[PDB]
Amino acid sequence: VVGGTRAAQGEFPFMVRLSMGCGGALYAQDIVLTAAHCVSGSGNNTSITATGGVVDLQSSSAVKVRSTKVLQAPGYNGTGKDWALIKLAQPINQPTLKIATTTAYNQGTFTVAGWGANREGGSQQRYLLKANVPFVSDAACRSAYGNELVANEEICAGYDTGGVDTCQGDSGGPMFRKDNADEWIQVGIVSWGEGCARKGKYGVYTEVSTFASAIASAARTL
């Protein structure tokens, strides 16, 4: 995350760090929602580790749990549909992040968080960083990215003049905001962008509302 500040311990307890250099959210205590592009595909897999419970990855309170299976979005092949679920062998005992099932919250000021680079080309981070980025219309995003944008499956955010954005290593993490009931709700998954925090180059996120029933469907059978 570029242009952010340190998240406090316990502030976003649903955040998890994945071992291949991605973030994720606890959709269930033993099910991590991340980006399809952070993994190879669906199958029983135990080579991934999720670290939960801490903002400081070096903390003795970190809980590291191994994956048992990976379910990449059905139909994913690199163009849109950027979501995946990772079933954990043990649950991480922290609150889960509700996902948006309607488009009602695809607007406003979002919150992003991750252990990715805090400057384009930079190193990953020890401490979780958070930032706020504004919703950007698909049209504004299309002027920035042209045919690369899959409008009904991607939601954009960031400032036209740059400065605040997710960056390498933040992929897979949740983009969220409050709902009417004062609960965080997930509207996006960090997916891609051109550079980080550049002028005119917004961050692109998986539009969770488009995939919510499919993610829930996958989760019940995972």
In angstroms, what is the minimal distance from the CB of 107 to Ca ion? Answer: 11
Considering only the stretches 36-44, 56-64, 133-141, 171-179, report the one whose residues sit in contact with Ca ion under the rule CB under 5 A.
Answer: 133-141
- Record the tokens describing residue 151, joined without a space: 């409008």
In angstroms, what is the minimal distance from the CB of 189 to Ca ion? Answer: 13
Considering only the stretches 111-119, 127-135, 145-153, 176-184, report the one whose residues sit in contact with Ca ion under the rule CB under 5 A.
Answer: 145-153
Look up 171 and say whether it is catalytic.
yes
Which residues does residue 206 pair with via DSSP β-bridges, in sequence order? Answer: 154, 189
Does residue 120 belong to the site contacting Ca ion (CB under 5 A)?
no
In angstroms, what is the minimal distance from the CB of 17 to Ca ion? Answer: 27
Which residues does residue 188 pair with via DSSP β-bridges, in sequence order? Answer: 175, 207
Does residue 140 belong to the site contacting Ca ion (CB under 5 A)?
no
Catalytic residue among 30, 37, 42, 165: 37
Instruction: Choose between 56 and 160: whose C-beta lies nearer to Ca ion.
Output: 160
State which of positions 195-214 bind Ca ion (CB under 5 A).
207
Does residue 138 belong to the site contacting Ca ion (CB under 5 A)?
yes
For residue 37, which phi and psi values (nearest 5 degrees)? -70, -10
Residue nearest to Ca ion (CB): 138
Whose CA is closest to 193, among 149, 163, 130? 149
State how far Cα 14 lies from the chain centre. Answer: 11
- Record the tokens describing residue 129, joined without a space: 């960083």
Look up 138 and say whether it is catalytic.
no
For residue 143, which phi and psi values (nearest 5 degrees)? -70, -30
199/164 Cα distance (integer angstroms): 10
> In terms of C-beta density within 10 A (0-12 exposed, 13-18 middle, 19 or more buried), how is residue 97 classed?
buried
Instruction: Choose between 14 and 145: whose C-beta lies nearer to Ca ion.
Output: 145
Number of chain positions touching Ca ion (CB under 5 A) = 4
Instruction: Choose between 62 and 214: whose C-beta lies nearer to Ca ion.
Output: 214
Catalytic residue among 30, 82, 165, 170: 82
CA dist 73 → 35, 153, 221 (Å):
9, 12, 13
Positions marked active-site: 37, 82, 171
Interface ranges with Ca ion (CB under 5 A): 138, 151, 155, 207
